[PDB]
Design a protein around this nucleic acid. Structure first.
Length: 902
DNA sequence: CGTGGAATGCAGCCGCG
DNA sequence: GCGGCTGCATTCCA
């Protein structure tokens, strides 16, 4: 098989690499890699190397990376550019694997673990690791086994062994309900003392050293804990065995008002699934704990248990171990879904970099570009330093707060990557500048044409139209790849149909499954060849037919990820190809583009509706625009439509046959106006919203920028059986809104958009009448408490102490002198509730930890003094008032008309 | 080290017979 | 007594 790398590290003058050799066996090797950097040389000197600017460079082959680094230093002291890949691991990787990397994940050891540390005090700080590790479940992808290490005796109790039989049983049976899929994949290992446990684990760890290390928070907890626990009990060199090259290093990170340390293990790639999630989930959740995410992704979280976790081992050691096992597994399941590990591997090997760098847009693109330029003997620019100079971004139209009955949204395809291609923006394509006129003079097409020789941008930047830019070329390549892969898909879906006929018209003749490439389209000599084929073996020809299709789908996703993570890199000063003028060129262009089309779409909808100067475009936002179709409906009559689905088709037909052509004509003019290298501005109809035909409901409403709601029926050609509410920015997406409320808000909105004023009123009056009878946890506002002691002057609010930080004070007091009371930990979230004066608590509000009910020590009184009026008014009424005001509706009859004023 | 647009809860001032 | 503003807090469109 092809030979690929697992991990690479540079340890002072040496390259340590773990890799899969030609026979599939894992290997590790040390190499005194000889790096090569480049310097500019005179034309007289003949070479095959030139920088991206065409200037000739002489190649310099150093004896060791140290010398190379030393050289770069001297070059900075003289003031001369030092071209070449400064990251020697990348270079080494480029040379050792100069060909499309093809790996077999089946040979890559992916470890997934979690630990348990019984702690009486607070959270057991990893940097200290003051308490014994009483459990470790470590899953190995190569063996597909869960290795459990159980501590039988510790200063916190001596327990019996964990029963697998009991673990398999049902809850109602006194069991732990550990799934039947992993019940036979468990290997239990109890121990008498912790030293015996740690040393056995560390030993197992040498036998099956992970290549990829994952888990939930394993990088900020698990790893540091185990490492420090071992370093303190045994010495530091023993703790270093966690690294296959016996090298570690502590890193420091400052998040908010404090810091945390992680341990770097040379020779391993740590992809903490919590970070992996946050980066590729693209679904911001209110809580990122495994229990929340697992419940939200798997529809079931981590096992349940009674009493505090710090006492679970002493109270029910059986559930304690099972809870540990299930924790590891829950993460494995989420991955069975999102497949973010694979997403990392295939992405890392594409760019040819350390898998853990998949977290950096910069590192990935620098790696991708470096490899391209290298193939054509070109030398990359020297990483230069740049002052963080904020530049303008996307244009967002200030909407007129109001209701909108019919709406049609349109979006531009990959706006930023597109503009880079169309204008041909790149550090080496800069040709010159030109007298810049007010952006508006460009949007209304009244400014002088920038130039008739160079591709231009509204910020005054001019680019060569002939030469191919380095950046643009590279994006285009990825775009072209995403396409060639949809091709391997939209085909492996049809070639799979000519095979799906296994029972439709089966045959016989028992033999091996037909040998053909399911990817590339089938042949006629093979289409007629599948006649005399066994219907039994015919199934395997569909396993690959279905496999290839997915293999394709799992191909474009990665490509769009790169495409989308380019502008950021390019806009990031630490990027090799960064350039402030280019970033502003891309971005300012986007603005002209979005407002130029706005004008066109308005000019057109007026010259089609007869109107003189109507504002059809009610909102814009970076790359999309929302249009009002009201005038278009009235131009035919709502009565002239059978049902809702009838006026919907009308608009769709109108957009594709009238709008698109208008839009494209328009954008083409702009391309000619800016004398761009190529027309790439493409819009597509996105949504179509409106109220149910013959219903007193309003279309939707806009409160302000980024804040609105629509009732959509057709999203990009996809008609819904039931209209879906598209609420954006409103308080329904606000995690801080108590359930009962945030719920009641969506229903308030729905009634507004599909039923009308009167319906909304009926609901509001109902909800208020049935508010007290709602659960106190449900009607409570959630908040995260940061920096509490800063406003805690002896148990009381300090310098303008926040509302949520106040209640924490009233709480810390009410339970001051109790360890059984749920402790409110800094950096976490808490429930908040107002209190009526005269309350035996001191303050006007109280807040306790989240996901937990108020301690029975003060629960009774809290549930007796919580100010119900103040509560509703602030979380329901106040925000609904925001919606109804903009929508021009009342949520309460007899309201005042003059309120809108003063 | 992955870049700009922008929309509020409170918490305290200041300005007026 | 409540009407302007400003305190950065915190989240979210692209």
């Amino acid at each position: 098989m092809k030979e690929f790398y697992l991990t690479v590290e540079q340890i002072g003058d040496s390259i340590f690499e773990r890799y899969i050799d030609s026979n599939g066996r894992e290997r590790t090797r040390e190499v005194e890699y000889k790096p090569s950097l480049f310097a500019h040389c005179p034309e007289s000197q003949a070479t095959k190397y030139f920088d991206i600017y065409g200037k000739p460079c002489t190649r310099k082959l150093f004896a060791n990376m140290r010398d190379a680094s030393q050289w770069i230093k001297r070059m900075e002291d003289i003031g001369l550019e030092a071209l070449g890949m400064d990251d020697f691991k990348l270079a080494y990787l480029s040379d050792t694997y100069n060909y499309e990397i093809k790996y077999d994940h089946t040979k890559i050891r992916v470890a997934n673990f979690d630990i348990e540390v019984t702690s009486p005090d607070g959270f057991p700080e990893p940097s200290q690791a003051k308490h014994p590790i009483d459990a470790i479940t470590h899953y190995d992808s190569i063996d597909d086994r869960f290795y459990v290490f159980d501590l039988l005796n510790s200063p916190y109790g001596n327990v019996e062994e964990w029963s697998i039989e009991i673990a398999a049983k049902l809850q109602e049976q006194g069991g732990d309900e550990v799934p039947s899929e992993i019940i036979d994949k468990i290997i239990y290992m109890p121990f008498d003392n912790e030293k015996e446990l740690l040393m056995e684990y560390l030993n197992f760890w040498q036998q099956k050293t992970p290549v990829i290390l994952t888990g939930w928070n394993v990088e900020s907890f698990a790893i540091p804990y185990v490492y420090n626990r071992i370093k303190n009990i045994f010495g530091e060199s023993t703790a270093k065995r966690l690294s296959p090259h016996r090298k570690t290093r502590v890193k420091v990170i400052e998040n908010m008002y404090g810091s945390r340390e992680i341990i770097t293990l040379f020779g391993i790639s740590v992809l903490d699934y919590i970070d992996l999630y946050k980066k590729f989930s693209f679904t911001n959740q209110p809580s990122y704990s495994l229990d929340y995410i697992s419940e939200f992704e798997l529809n079931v979280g981590k096992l349940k248990y009674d009493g505090p976790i710090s006492k679970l081992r002493e109270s029910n050691h059986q559930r304690y171990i099972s809870y540990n096992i299930i924790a590891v597994y829950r993460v494995l399941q989420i991955d069975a879904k999102r497949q973010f590990i694979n997403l990392s591997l295939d992405m890392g090997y594409y760019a040819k970099i350390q898998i853990q760098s998949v977290f950096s847009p910069i590192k990935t693109w620098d790696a991708i570009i470096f490899n391209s330029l290298k193939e054509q003997n070109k030398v990359i620019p020297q990483g230069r330093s740049h002052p963080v100079q904020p530049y303008p971004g996307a244009f967002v139209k200030e909407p007129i707060p109001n209701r909108y009955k019919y709406v049609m949204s349109f979006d531009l395809t990959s706006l930023y990557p597109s503009i880079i291609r169309q204008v041909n923006i790149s550090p080496e394509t800069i040709a010159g500048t030109f007298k810049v006129a007010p952006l508006h003079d460009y949007i209304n097409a009244v400014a002088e044409r920038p130039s008739d020789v160079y591709s231009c941008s509204p910020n005054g930047m001019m680019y060569y139209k002939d030469r191919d830019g380095v950046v643009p070329t590279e994006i285009t390549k990825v775009f072209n790849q995403r396409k060639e892969h949809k091709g391997y898909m939209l085909a492996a879906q049809r070639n799979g149909e000519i095979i799906k006929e296994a029972l439709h018209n089966p045959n016989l003749s028992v033999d091996e499954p037909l040998d053909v490439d399911y990817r590339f389209d089938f042949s006629d000599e093979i289409k007629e060849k599948i006649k005399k084929l066994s219907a039994k073996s015919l199934n395997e020809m569909l396993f690959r037919a279905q496999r290839t299709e997915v293999a394709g789908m799992t191909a474009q996703i990665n490509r769009k990820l790169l495409i989308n993570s380019l502008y950021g890199a390019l806009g990031n000063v630490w990027f090799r190809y960064y350039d402030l003028r280019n970033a502003t060129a891309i971005t300012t262009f986007g603005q002209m583009a979005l407002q130029w089309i706005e004008r066109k779409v308005n000019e057109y909808l007026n010259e089609v509706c007869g109107t003189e100067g109507e504002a059809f475009v009610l909102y814009g936002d970076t790359d999309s625009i929302y249009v009002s179709a009201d005038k278009i409906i009235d131009k035919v009559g709502e009565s002239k439509f059978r049902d809702t689905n009838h006026w919907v088709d009308f608009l769709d037909k109108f957009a594709r046959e009238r709008m698109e052509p208008a839009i494209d004509r328009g954008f083409r003019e702009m391309c000619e106006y800016m004398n761009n290298k190529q027309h790439l501005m493409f819009m597509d109809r996105e949504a179509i919203a409106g109220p149910p035909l013959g219903s007193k409901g309003i279309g939707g409403f806009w409160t302000g920028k980024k804040r609105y709601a629509l009732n959509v029926w057709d999203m990009e050609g996809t008609r819904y059986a039931e209209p879906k509410l598209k609420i954006m920015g409103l308080e329904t997406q606000k995690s801080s809104t108590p359930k009962a409320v945030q719920k009641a808000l969506k229903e308030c909105i729905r009634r507004m958009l599909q039923e009308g004023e009167e319906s909304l009123q009926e609901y509001f009056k109902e909800f208020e009448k049935e508010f007290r009878q709602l659960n106190y946890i449900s009607i409570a506002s959630v908040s995260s408490a940061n920096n509490i002691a800063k406003y805690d002057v002896g148990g009381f609010p300090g310098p303008k102490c926040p509302f949520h930080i106040r209640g924490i004070l009233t709480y810390n007091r009410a339970i001051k002198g109790n360890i059984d009371a749920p402790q409110v930990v800094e950096g976490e979230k808490v429930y908040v509730l107002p209190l009526r004066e005269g309350n035996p608590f001191g303050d006007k509000c109280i807040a306790w930890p989240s996901g937990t009910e108020i301690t029975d020590l003060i629960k009774d009184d809290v549930l007796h003094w919580m100010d119900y009026t103040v509560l509703l008014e602030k979380t329901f009424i106040k925000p609904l008032e925001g919606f109804t005001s903009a929508a021009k509706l009342d949520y309460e009859k007899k309201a005042s008309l003059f309120d809108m004023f003063d």
